[PDB]
């Protein structure tokens, strides 16, 4: 199947409380495998999945070197944007950055990304062609012009189409057991009486991997999208994911309702009924 590698970076100013906070996390698909936290004692890129613990001091030292540089860049960036938007030194502000690459089921380069937000809004993004930039406002055009002159898109395109996907493929092979696995959802329904004339039927999906899943209810085969309570997919904490979907079923109508589960780990999609 298809895969991704993504890095996510958060930098938050903390005026009068010292240095900005800087958190970096890296993922393959839905599996986190590295982290850096500026506030933590080690001051090192650190492993968070067991397959990357095998990599060795050259790897760990080079990822530490790069993430430390980024922490310092984003310190300057916080001051630069404060200047761009004429903001006071009093307020806390947030810079986020994400980049990464996607490969298709052939494991060849499919798509690459590199984008930023300031205070929760789109600031600048590399467009799909890996050649040009989308700039939100007037501040982001200043950044855009800087990056145009410094040929930042060209450097990124080479990374995203070459290095990024070469290391993704290396991770997928070295971490095959964890990263090329699917855990099928373990499923069940519960039934709880609301009152005398209706009941909640809740369809559960547990311990699945990856996070992508479709969980829907039908009544006589008609989709109940409007009338289903659906929670966000949520992590279990052990690398698997959970989701439920519920409907309110009037008296004697349980047999009309079917829950439908689609997930990569199932040999065929499931149709579950309370009966």
């Amino acid at each position: 199947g298809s895969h991704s590698m993504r890095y996510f970076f958060t930098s938050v100013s903390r005026p009068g409380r010292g240095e900005p906070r800087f958190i970096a996390v890296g993922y393959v698909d839905d599996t986190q495998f590295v982290r850096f936290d500026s506030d933590a004692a080690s001051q090192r890129m650190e492993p968070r999945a067991p397959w990357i613990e095998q990599e060795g001091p050259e790897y760990w030292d080079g990822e530490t070197r790069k993430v430390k540089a980024h922490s310092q860049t984003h310190r300057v960036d916080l001051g630069t944007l404060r200047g761009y938007y004429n903001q006071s030194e009093a307020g806390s502000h947030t810079v986020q950055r994400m980049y990464g690459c996607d490969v298709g089921s052939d494991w060849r380069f499919l798509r690459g990304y590199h984008q930023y937000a300031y205070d929760g809004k789109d600031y600048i993004a590399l467009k799909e062609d890996l050649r040009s930039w989308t700039a939100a406002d007037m501040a982001a055009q200043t950044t855009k012009h800087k990056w145009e002159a410094a040929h930042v898109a060209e450097q990124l395109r080479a990374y995203l189409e070459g290095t990024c996907v070469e290391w993704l493929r290396r991770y997928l092979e070295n971490g095959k057991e964890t990263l090329q696995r699917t855990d099928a959802p373990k499923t069940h329904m519960t039934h709880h009486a609301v009152s005398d004339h209706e009941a909640t039927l809740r369809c559960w999906a547990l311990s699945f991997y990856p996070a992508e899943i479709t969980l829907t209810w039908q009544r006589d085969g008609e989709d109940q999208t409007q009338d289903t309570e659906l929670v966000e997919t949520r992590p279990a904490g052990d690398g698997t994911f959970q989701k439920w979907a519920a409907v309110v079923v009037p008296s004697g109508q349980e047999q009309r309702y079917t829950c439908h589960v689609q997930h990569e780990g199932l040999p065929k999609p499931l149709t579950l009924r309370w009966e």
Binding site: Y7, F9, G26, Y59, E63, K66, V67, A69, H70, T73, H74, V76, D77, T80, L81, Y84, V95, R97, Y99, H114, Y116, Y123, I124, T143, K146, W147, A150, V152, Q155, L156, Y159, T163, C164, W167
Partner: peptide, 9 residues
């Protein structure tokens, strides 16, 4: 494996 720089905004 990270990209080497964060380019200045």
């Amino acid at each position: 494996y990270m990209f080497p720089n964060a380019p200045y905004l």
